[PDB]
Amino acid sequence: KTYLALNENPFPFPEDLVDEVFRRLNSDALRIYYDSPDEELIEKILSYLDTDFLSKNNVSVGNGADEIIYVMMLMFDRSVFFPPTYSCYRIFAKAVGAKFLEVPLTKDLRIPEVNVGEGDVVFIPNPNNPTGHVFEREEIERILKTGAFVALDEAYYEFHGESYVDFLKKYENLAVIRTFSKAFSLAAQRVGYVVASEKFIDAYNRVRLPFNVSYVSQMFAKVALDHREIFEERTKFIVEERERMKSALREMGYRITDSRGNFVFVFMEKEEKERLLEHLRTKNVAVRSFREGVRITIGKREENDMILRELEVFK
Amino acid sequence: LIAKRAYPYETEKRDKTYLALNENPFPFPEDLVDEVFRRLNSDALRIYYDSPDEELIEKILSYLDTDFLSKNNVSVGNGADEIIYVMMLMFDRSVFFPPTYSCYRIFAKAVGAKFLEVPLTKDLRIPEVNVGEGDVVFIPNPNNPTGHVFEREEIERILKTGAFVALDEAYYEFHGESYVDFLKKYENLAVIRTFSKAFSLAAQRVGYVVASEKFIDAYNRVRLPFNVSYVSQMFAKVALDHREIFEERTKFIVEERERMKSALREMGYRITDSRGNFVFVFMEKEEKERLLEHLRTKNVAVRSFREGVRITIGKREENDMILRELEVF
Ligand SMILES: *Cc1c(COP(=O)(O)O)cnc(C)c1O
Ligand SMILES: *Cc1c(COP(=O)(O)O)cnc(C)c1O
């Protein structure tokens, strides 16, 4: 069943690297409560961020970006996001028992307008999920300026050029959220990290479980970082394949988003939508369904061309 | 801003000989480590793996060894800690009884749950409590740090209250009994288990809850969907496929613990009838410190508490050292 529904990296984790992990782990470590953010892991996360302002104290980690989101809504009066966004901001907020406010994105995906100010946390996944489009930093400042806390979920950073992390130089009410689930093929290992003001990390760490990231998991994070180029070349393909089938879709007469993620969003009505879903299913093909369209993830060349073929015998 | 009074985050400074966190003395079988990576599926690390793995659950049932427990009575968590953590988000009020698992209180504050602490009797018994439905009452049996064992009727009393009981059996492996069977009659109960202790897997955070089908159904909705890594489950899994190797280490832990006790008593020491992978030794402050002061002098770490000290069972040579060090006091 050709799977393209969760923005999962088409590439398995390099076998070479799995070995290095295995060959670099100390059996004697598995018995003890290993430090959550490894001193080493943070050092690698920094050299990967490549900055000159953030330090050790500006970083922490979570059991997958999620746990980060999950624990942040726990430390703010109200969570504010803007559908259509990450499907889990709503679910988690409700589960954690946080007060949230959902303000629909404009007719043009732009960030709406609402109260928002200190005491608030506003989740802005840029590249957004699931349109994949990118909020212009002019926009994130608007909200930063409100004094409210901005949680930039740069979960798709690797697929898109820049990341507004540098905003940390002049805004302390911001925290960048990243993950290894995407570009690094570690979605099953649950490793995510956060970048924010020292005052933040110091608080964040106090509310999160002490040991939220397995020994073995940071190792993968760490080995993964020591071979970033291997991944940056899969990514290079992911994107090059993505900004292909987009051109391939527009030709077929589809209306898509200018996504900069490891996926493409295809706009289309509920009726005909439910139709090609029943058609894709008879073709063992799966994609992410939503309101206002479908989000198809980027897979292997053959999978990718599959979509373009089965999506033309339709429209 | 939003500044908090809660205790700061730190990382235990581990001495040359650490006996402060109830960690299994022995490393994870090197052989099993291999078995783990041998099953490890390269192209699996790239997908969102089911947290409660189908076979892990099954392995867990096999471990609990019953007839009434089914796949709908079992779930997992990012360590028994994560279970405690998310559980508190579920109930209006969390209830525990010092001396107890110190993280209850701590977690209580991180999450913002409402809680009430009711000291145990001088004989370590659950006191009277205005508890009832809407409340979750955490009772780690065998107890931490005393390690003493609560009685059946002691737990069922609270159970009949209608109040939801969290029976934290993090230390079951070091004690014969477990009151999981209570799930036959009562639903307002959940047993918390863990691979951190007797399975030398604390570094891989892998815990599980056995509770009534209606409860799990709820828990899965609250907890993070993917809270246990594919590799972490793998570890827990093979671990179960080789429980023998472990149970034999546990046999050692206990045989070593019961020894240590008998010896500590002769010393004149007043200890607890600890049924966990440790021993609790009551001491009177202005001499309890003189013990620690010394131990710190000799690069030794034990867990200091209100009324005394909790010492973890380590390797034989270590257990041999504590006895000696305590004699001279
Ligand atoms: C995929 C995704 C996540 C999940 O990341 P993990 O590292 O698997 O927790 C979080 N946020 C957004 C916006 C995502 O798209
Ligand atoms: C040690 C301990 C825990 C921690 O379990 P993990 O699986 O390591 O999270 C939970 N509860 C009690 C009562 C403990 O003593």
From Swiss-Prot, chain A:
Q: Name one Pfam family in it.
A: Aminotran_1_2
Which reaction does this enzyme catalyse, per its entry?
L-histidinol phosphate + 2-oxoglutarate = 3-(imidazol-4-yl)-2-oxopropyl phosphate + L-glutamate
Can you provide one Gene Ontology molecular function annotated for this UniProt record? protein homodimerization activity
This entry's Enzyme Commission designation comes to: 2.6.1.9
Say which enzyme class the record assigns.
Answer: transferase
InterPro entries xref list: Aminotrans_II_pyridoxalP_BS, Aminotransferase_I/II_large, HisP_aminotrans, HistidinolP_aminotransfase, PyrdxlP-dep_Trfase, PyrdxlP-dep_Trfase_major, PyrdxlP-dep_Trfase_small
The record's Gene Ontology biological-process terms are: L-histidine biosynthetic process
Q: Where are the transmembrane segments?
A: none
List N6-(pyridoxal phosphate)lysine occurrences by residue.
Answer: 182
Keywords noted in UniProt: Amino-acid biosynthesis, Aminotransferase, Histidine biosynthesis, Pyridoxal phosphate, Transferase
Q: Which cofactor does it need?
A: pyridoxal 5'-phosphate
Domain of life from the UniProt record: Bacteria
Q: Which residues form a coiled coil?
A: none
Biochemical pathway: Amino-acid biosynthesis; L-histidine biosynthesis; L-histidine from 5-phospho-alpha-D-ribose 1-diphosphate: step 7/9
Q: Which family does it belong to?
A: Belongs to the class-II pyridoxal-phosphate-dependent aminotransferase family. Histidinol-phosphate aminotransferase subfamily.
Q: How does it assemble?
A: Homodimer.
- Protein name according to UniProt: Histidinol-phosphate aminotransferase
Lineage, top ranks = Bacteria, Thermotogati, Thermotogota, Thermotogae, Thermotogales
Q: By which gene is this protein encoded?
A: hisC
Swiss-Prot record, chain B:
Which GO terms of type biological process are on file? L-histidine biosynthetic process
The alphabetical list of record keywords is: Amino-acid biosynthesis, Aminotransferase, Histidine biosynthesis, Pyridoxal phosphate, Transferase
Sorted alphabetically, which Gene3D superfamilies does this protein's record hold?
Aspartate Aminotransferase, domain 1, Type I PLP-dependent aspartate aminotransferase-like (Major domain)
Q: PROSITE patterns, from UniProt?
A: AA_TRANSFER_CLASS_2
What reaction gets catalysed by this protein? L-histidinol phosphate + 2-oxoglutarate = 3-(imidazol-4-yl)-2-oxopropyl phosphate + L-glutamate
Query: EC annotation?
Result: 2.6.1.9
Point out residues bearing the modification N6-(pyridoxal phosphate)lysine.
197
Cofactor section: pyridoxal 5'-phosphate
Major enzyme class: transferase
Q: In which pathway does it act?
A: Amino-acid biosynthesis; L-histidine biosynthesis; L-histidine from 5-phospho-alpha-D-ribose 1-diphosphate: step 7/9
Concerning CDD domains, the annotation shows: AAT_like
Q: In the record, what terms sit under GO molecular function?
A: histidinol-phosphate transaminase activity; protein homodimerization activity; pyridoxal phosphate binding
Disulfide bond entries: none
Q: What NCBIfam families does the record tag this protein with?
A: hisC
Subunit comment for this entry?
A: Homodimer.
Q: Which family does it belong to?
A: Belongs to the class-II pyridoxal-phosphate-dependent aminotransferase family. Histidinol-phosphate aminotransferase subfamily.
Q: Give the protein's recorded name.
A: Histidinol-phosphate aminotransferase
> To which species is this protein native?
Thermotoga maritima (strain ATCC 43589 / DSM 3109 / JCM 10099 / NBRC 100826 / MSB8)
Gene that produces this protein? hisC
